[PDB]
Amino acid sequence: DIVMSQSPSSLAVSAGEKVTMSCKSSQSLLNSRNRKNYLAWYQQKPGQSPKPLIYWASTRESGVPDRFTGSGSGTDFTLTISSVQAEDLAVYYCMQSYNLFTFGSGTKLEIKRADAAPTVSIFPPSSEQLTSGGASVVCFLNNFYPKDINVKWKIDGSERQNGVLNSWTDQDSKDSTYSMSSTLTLTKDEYERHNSYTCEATHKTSTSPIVKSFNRNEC
Amino acid sequence: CPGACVCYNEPKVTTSCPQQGLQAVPTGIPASSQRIFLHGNRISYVPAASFQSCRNLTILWLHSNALAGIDAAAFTGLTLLEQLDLSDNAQLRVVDPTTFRGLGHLHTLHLDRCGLQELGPGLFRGLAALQYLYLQDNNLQALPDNTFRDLGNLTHLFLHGNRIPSVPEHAFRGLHSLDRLLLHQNHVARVHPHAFRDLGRLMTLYLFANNLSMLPAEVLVPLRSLQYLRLNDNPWVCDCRARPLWAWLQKFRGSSSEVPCNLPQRLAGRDLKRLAASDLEGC
Amino acid sequence: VQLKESGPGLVAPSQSLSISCSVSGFSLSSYGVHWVRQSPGQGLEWLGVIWSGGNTHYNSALMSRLSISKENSKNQVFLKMNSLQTDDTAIYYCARVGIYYEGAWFAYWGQGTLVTVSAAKTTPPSVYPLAPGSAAQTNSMVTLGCLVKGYFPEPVTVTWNSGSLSSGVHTFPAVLQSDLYTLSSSVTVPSSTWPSETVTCNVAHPASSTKVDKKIVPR
Ligand SMILES: [Zn+2]
Numbered sequence: 001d002i003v004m005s006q007s008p009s010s011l012a013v014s015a016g017e018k019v020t021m022s023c024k025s026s027q028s029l030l031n032s033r034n035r036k037n038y039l040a041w042y043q044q045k046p047g048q049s050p051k052p053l054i055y056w057a058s059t060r061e062s063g064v065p066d067r068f069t070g071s072g073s074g075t076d077f078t079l080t081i082s083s084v085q086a087e088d089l090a091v092y093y094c095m096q097s098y099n100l101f102t103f104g105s106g107t108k109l110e111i112k113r114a115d116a117a118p119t120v121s122i123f124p125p126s127s128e129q130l131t132s133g134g135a136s137v138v139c140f141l142n143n144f145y146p147k148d149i150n151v152k153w154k155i156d157g158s159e160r161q162n163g164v165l166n167s168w169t170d171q172d173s174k175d176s177t178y179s180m181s182s183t184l185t186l187t188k189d190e191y192e193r194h195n196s197y198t199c200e201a202t203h204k205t206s207t208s209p210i211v212k213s214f215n216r217n218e219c
Numbered sequence: 220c221p222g223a224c225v226c227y228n229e230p231k232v233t234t235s236c237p238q239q240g241l242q243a244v245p246t247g248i249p250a251s252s253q254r255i256f257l258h259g260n261r262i263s264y265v266p267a268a269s270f271q272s273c274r275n276l277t278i279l280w281l282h283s284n285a286l287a288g289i290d291a292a293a294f295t296g297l298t299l300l301e302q303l304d305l306s307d308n309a310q311l312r313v314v315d316p317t318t319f320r321g322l323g324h325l326h327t328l329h330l331d332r333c334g335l336q337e338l339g340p341g342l343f344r345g346l347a348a349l350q351y352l353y354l355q356d357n358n359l360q361a362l363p364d365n366t367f368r369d370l371g372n373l374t375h376l377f378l379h380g381n382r383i384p385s386v387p388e389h390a391f392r393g394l395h396s397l398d399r400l401l402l403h404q405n406h407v408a409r410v411h412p413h414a415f416r417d418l419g420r421l422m423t424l425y426l427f428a429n430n431l432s433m434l435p436a437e438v439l440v441p442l443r444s445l446q447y448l449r450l451n452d453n454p455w456v457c458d459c460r461a462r463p464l465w466a467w468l469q470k471f472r473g474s475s476s477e478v479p480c481n482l483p484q485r486l487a488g489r490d491l492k493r494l495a496a497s498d499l500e501g502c
Numbered sequence: 503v504q505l506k507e508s509g510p511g512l513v514a515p516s517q518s519l520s521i522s523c524s525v526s527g528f529s530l531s532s533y534g535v536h537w538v539r540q541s542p543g544q545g546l547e548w549l550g551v552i553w554s555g556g557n558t559h560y561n562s563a564l565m566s567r568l569s570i571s572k573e574n575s576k577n578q579v580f581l582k583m584n585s586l587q588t589d590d591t592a593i594y595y596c597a598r599v600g601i602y603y604e605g606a607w608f609a610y611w612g613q614g615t616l617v618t619v620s621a622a623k624t625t626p627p628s629v630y631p632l633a634p635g636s637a638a639q640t641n642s643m644v645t646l647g648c649l650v651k652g653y654f655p656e657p658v659t660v661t662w663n664s665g666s667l668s669s670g671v672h673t674f675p676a677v678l679q680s681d682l683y684t685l686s687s688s689v690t691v692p693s694s695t696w697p698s699e700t701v702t703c704n705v706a707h708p709a710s711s712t713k714v715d716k717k718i719v720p721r
Binding site for chain 1: 538547561613669685688690
């Protein structure tokens with residue numbers, strides 16, 4: 001019918017490099033006479049509703065930093081940031097307004113950095129959870145980059161993979177930096193046994209890890 | 220009410236947004252709106268169903284913008300619209316022939332000076348109550364037949380300063396209650412004989428500044444109530460062909476103007492009205 | 503100028519959805535409202551609109567399903583949707599502007615109210631305070647945390663010190679264990695403000711009608 005096609009779904013660059021989105025429409029979006037093109041661009045930062053960056057292919061909404069451009073006619077539409085700021089982490093949606101309202105599928109801007117170590121922080125299950133049958137040790141791996149990171153747990157000095165959960169954050173609006181959590185859920189029954197609980201962290205930054213740990217039957 | 224526009228309820232509910240610098244038709248105009256003034260802005264299109272919410276609209280102006288096109292169903296939803304102004308829109312050129320469908324209670328319509336090249340078939344169809352029609356200063360190049368047929372109550376029709384070259388038989392058919400007809404300042408060459416029939420009540424007829432070399436016998440008669448007439452500076456050829464027309468100006472005890480000649484070379488610049496009949500050669 | 507979507511937040515399949523969209527900054531007689539939907543990981547999709555007048559155009563992709571009404575005096579737009587499958591789990595934004603043309607093309611949004619289509623009963627969260635045990639410290643930045651565990655459905659909101667902290671908080675997206683969601687959240691205050699300067703997580707859960715404030719006790 002009418003359709004909006006966005007490439008390349010996701011594209012990483014450092015801060016200061018130029019970019020382009022590509023947005024091809026199904027049917028031509030140019031009004032025969034007057035020639036304004038009924039196509040908008042929107043910025044959806046993480047955990048945040050969309051925000052109008054451009055409309056009429058070409059013109060910038062109130063306030064939107066002078067550092068954006070959108071061009072092309074008929075059926076091929078660019079969005080271009082020159083010198084990308086850290087704060088510009090978002091996914092970028094184009095919208096058709098010729099026959100009603102049809103969206104693209106969006107294109108995510110990644111931010112390249114220099115490699116970065118995590119701050120490791122480890123947490124014995126609470127007083128409050130233990131009197132519930134349950135036990136969860138937690139490991140906070142904080143403000144680090146690149147995203148790809150491995151955490152081995154070590155109980156009594158020997159691994160567990162059975163019953164761990166991982167959770168990654170979205171690249172930091174202000175910082176270009178990932179953080180992530182690891183939860184081992186043993187149980188008061190299953191936990192009150194084996195005694196040393198420890199956290200390893202191997203990276204694209206590390207060979208010899210970042211290690212934090214604690215001993216249950218000690219204090 | 221939207222950025223920098225007047226909004227008042229008496230006399231009628233009203234949105235005045237004159238020369239704000241608006242790039243198009245604004246969102247925000249209340250549906251209550253009885254009058255919308257969008258004139259002097261820089262709008263380049265009237266979208267499909269712009270004023271559709273305002274089912275009370277009786278007056279809307281969009282003159283003196285930068286109109287390139289009106290979309291064919293722009294004025295959909297506007298049963299009550301009485302006045303419509305669309306002028307000083309220089310570069311507009313064409314209006315889709317369905318643009319006015321169903322504006323039943325329209326009193327006045329302005330397309331003065333829009334560079335209109337055509338007059339699409341049945342454009343003023345169903346404008347029963349139209350009274351004033353302003354189509355002067357455009358680039359109209361023909362007059363289709365029946366173009367104003369459905370215009371029952373049109374009294375003033377304005378056509379001057381175009382490029383019309385002729386008037387065909389059935390052009391003005393149906394203008395049963397016309398009153399002022401201004402056709403001056405054109406490139407007009409030949410009037411069809413039976414061409415003013417349906418104009419019993421015609422009162423003012425300005426044919427000056429055209430290319431009329433002669434007006435043939437049958438023409439003028441049906442203007443049984445004509446009070447004013449203008450036929451100055453036409454390349455009038457003053458021989459046997461004008462005798463018919465001459466006889467007419469004699470009997471006509473209203474208010475005509477000078478009909479200067481130009482031909483034959485012998486008879487230059489000589490108001491016909493003060494000529495003798497034997498003065499005009501044969502035949 | 504703002505829109506704030508609300509109402510029934512978990513709906514059982516083969517039943518009815520009712521949202522409301524409340525507004526400040528403009529009247530419903532003067533501007534018209536829209537409804538855009540977005541999955542928990544997909545592109546935007548426009549549902550429909552209710553113009554400045556009584557008229558109404560939806561997307562018909564959803565056949566009978568759909569009805570937009572609005573009450574003018576009460577400044578509310580109602581989005582009703584019957585007979586919905588789990589396809590229709592998404593966030594439900596109401597945005598505005600408004601139509602004919604210039605003014606705005608979803609240039610204002612809501613934050614968006616998140617709908618889950620599922621038939622599992624709503625479960626409140628357990629909240630555990632992750633104090634760093636026996637240590638605290640050497641890291642001249644004591645990094646604390648708080649586990650939010652075994653709830654349904656989303657969302658869930660975590661704040662710290664009743665909002666006084668909102669930089670240094672990293673809050674991780676929820677994970678789906680068995681048929682229940684679980685989340686954790688770090689905070690990373692200065693060392694020389696903990697023990698001293700009490701630090702508390704305030705995890706509230708709208709879907710269960712449940713507000714919790716858990717203090718975080720040292721050692
Ligand atoms: Zn738009």
